[PDB]
Design a protein around this ligand. Sequence first.
Ligand SMILES: CC1(C)Cc2cc(Cl)ccc2C(N[C@@H](Cc2cscc2-c2cn[nH]c2)C(=O)O)=N1
Ligand SMILES: [Zn+2]
Ligand SMILES: [Zn+2]
Ligand SMILES: [Zn+2]
Length: 393
Amino acid sequence: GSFVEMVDNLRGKSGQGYYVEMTVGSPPQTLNILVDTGSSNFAVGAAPHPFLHRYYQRQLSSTYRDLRKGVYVPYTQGKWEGELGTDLVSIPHGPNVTVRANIAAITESDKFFINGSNWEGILGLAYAEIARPDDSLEPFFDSLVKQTHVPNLFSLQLCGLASVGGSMIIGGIDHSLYTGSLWYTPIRREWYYEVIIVRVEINGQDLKMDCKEYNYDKSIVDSGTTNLRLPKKVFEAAVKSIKAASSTEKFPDGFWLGEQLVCWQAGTTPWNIFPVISLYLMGEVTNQSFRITILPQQYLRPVEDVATSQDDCYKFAISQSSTGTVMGAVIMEGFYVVFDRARKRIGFAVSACHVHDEFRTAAVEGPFVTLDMEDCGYNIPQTDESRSHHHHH
Ligand SMILES: CC1(C)Cc2cc(Cl)ccc2C(N[C@@H](Cc2cscc2-c2cn[nH]c2)C(=O)O)=N1
Ligand SMILES: [Zn+2]
Ligand SMILES: [Zn+2]
Ligand SMILES: [Zn+2]
């Protein structure tokens, strides 16, 4: 209700996401939960694991109700699986309400929990369509809004191992967390937080692709993804351009693949040879867009290893995708991002936790007017499995 209580309620480690405290059950069990706008389950570690000291103990919650239904959730990189139920859930540093939500108690997992990350569970903030095992499992935020008078919106300020902070404001927008204008791009379809990129520039220069290539096969806003991820053709045009701009430096191929650090003497990194990247997002008005401009300090991420303490070393945090553009924590860290589910749009403003550069600034600017936007959306080939399923909503 007053966002002073919700400011600074996220923590994390670099490249391991941002988590918020939540309490589950009665009496309350406090757990650190990853904020993930890329998925739609609330799932908590619920059995011992080498990388957890803490986990949800269903047997200690007088309010736990078992749903007697399993759930299995494969990723390209690993998996989690568990038993569905419901429990009382509150956010200690969030709105002053308690709700009964679905919770998947993770009983087995592979490559999901990481050594040292400090979270024990994930909060999928995206829409029911992508929930597992299907869209009848109501996601947490849908329950929150239905059961309380919490407005149907939340906003994220992600402030860039190494430790990180920021804010998730639930039910509102806190004006102390951004400067300048807030620009909105429509949510194209409520499954992921899917948006439409209409133009891409690297140091002022247009990539000049068919704009559907930018959104092939979707573009999404995803706090659960580290990198900016780009479709193959786009990723290759982008690497070409950033290489061109930085050609005073001849890096190994591993670097461009994210597989190798590149270093300079401490304090000497030539930031000026690395270009800014502007993504122009479809505006709320037909024929308008606005751009979000990313500094090299967002996509070249420092990594401290043992054998080069007097060097600053960096990993390239743009990577190739085969499942569309993903605007991950790398993009989000520049910005205050408003998930306005009520008005089916996403807002971007320059964050009050700025990443600065010597001479340039991360920016949100518009309008830019065209001959449409454009149509730059891609229509994913409709499978027979998708076609057949009935959605009685
Ligand atoms: C949302 C989440 C946790 C989903 C996920 C499931 C699995 Cl099994 C592995 C990695 C990830 C994963 N990967 C991120 C990296 C990341 C951001 S927060 C925690 C992670 C992570 C990396 N490995 N396991 C979690 C990515 O690919 O960019 N993100
Ligand atoms: Zn607390
Ligand atoms: Zn039917
Ligand atoms: Zn359905």
